[PDB]
Amino acid sequence: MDAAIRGNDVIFVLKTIGVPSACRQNEDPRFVEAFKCDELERYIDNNPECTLFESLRDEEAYSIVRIFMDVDLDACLDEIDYLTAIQDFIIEVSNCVARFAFTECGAIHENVIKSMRSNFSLTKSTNRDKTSFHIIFLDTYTTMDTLIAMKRTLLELSRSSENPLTRSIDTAVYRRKTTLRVVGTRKNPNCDTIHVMQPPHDNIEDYLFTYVDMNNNSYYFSLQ
Ligand SMILES: [Mg+2]
Ligand SMILES: [Mg+2]
């Protein structure tokens, strides 16, 4: 933990793709709402058609986030290839982030490796025609500007890798005002596929990239 780094338990969600700036700013409940996690879980239960997108509420004021990736393989994998690819993916992505943190962020390389590999949540999209998931490194924190600075590094990783999952990292998600679709909710009123939670993580806070509650196991770094 660190005095200079405070947490966040207020989750800001957009209720559709492409919300105006004016509607985010005025927080029109038709388009956006801030929730505690228990409120968010209840809202999802009570709104079975919802399409929810987590976003930083005021990233000029506060932009601490968990490292996350949106993996977009528009192809099907054999089950065993997928399991092997996930494990190799974790190694490749953690090595890549740890090197960037070490050289660009004054970070402790082994703490990035350990925090990333030891605890992460995985979703699985129900679309069986592809291999889509979101990953949250629950205990590895940074700033959104650091993720933006790391965008080309991840792009180059996705180009050099032989791993089909690493190759499918969607680096366009690292940008200002970005969104991550909330697990269990739909993308749009016309597509009914969802991401489901995966063991061993079954609480919604484990699937949110703006939920920040560090403990001494947590590790934080940012651009130096
Ligand atoms: Mg995706
Ligand atoms: Mg994507």
**Domains: count for the chain:** 1
Which residue range is the domain that position 45 belongs to? 11-220
Residue 1 lies in a domain: no
Nearest to 52 by CA among 167, 173, 179: 179
Instruction: Say which of 28, 74, 170, 213 is annotated catalytic.
Output: 170
Between the CA of 205 and the centroid of ligand 2 the distance, in Å, is 21
Residue 85 lies in a domain: yes
Residue 3 lies in a domain: no
Q: Are 113 and 93 in contact (CB under 8 A)?
A: no
Residue 2 lies in a domain: no
Between the CA of 75 and the centroid of ligand 1 the distance, in Å, is 12
Note the resolution in Å, 1 decimal.
1.6
- Report helix angle 151-160 to 79-104, nearest 10: 140
Between the CA of 70 and the centroid of ligand 1 the distance, in Å, is 5
Q: Solving technique for this entry?
A: X-ray
Rounded Cα–Cα distance for residues 105 and 49 (Å): 41
Between the CA of 1 and the centroid of ligand 2 the distance, in Å, is 32
Q: In 10 A of CB 44, how many CB atoms? A: 18
Q: State the ligand closest to the CA atom of 183.
A: 1
Residue 4 lies in a domain: no
Non-local (6+) Cβ contacts of 185 within 8 A are 44, 50, 51, 52, 194
Residue 158 lies in a domain: yes
Rounded Cα–Cα distance for residues 138 and 203 (Å): 12
> Is 45 labeled as catalytic in the residue annotation?
no
Non-local (6+) Cβ contacts of 115 within 8 A are 137, 139, 140, 217, 218, 219
Residue 6 lies in a domain: no
Rounded Cα–Cα distance for residues 58 and 122 (Å): 26
Residue 18 lies in a domain: yes
Q: Are 149 and 88 in contact (CB under 8 A)?
A: no
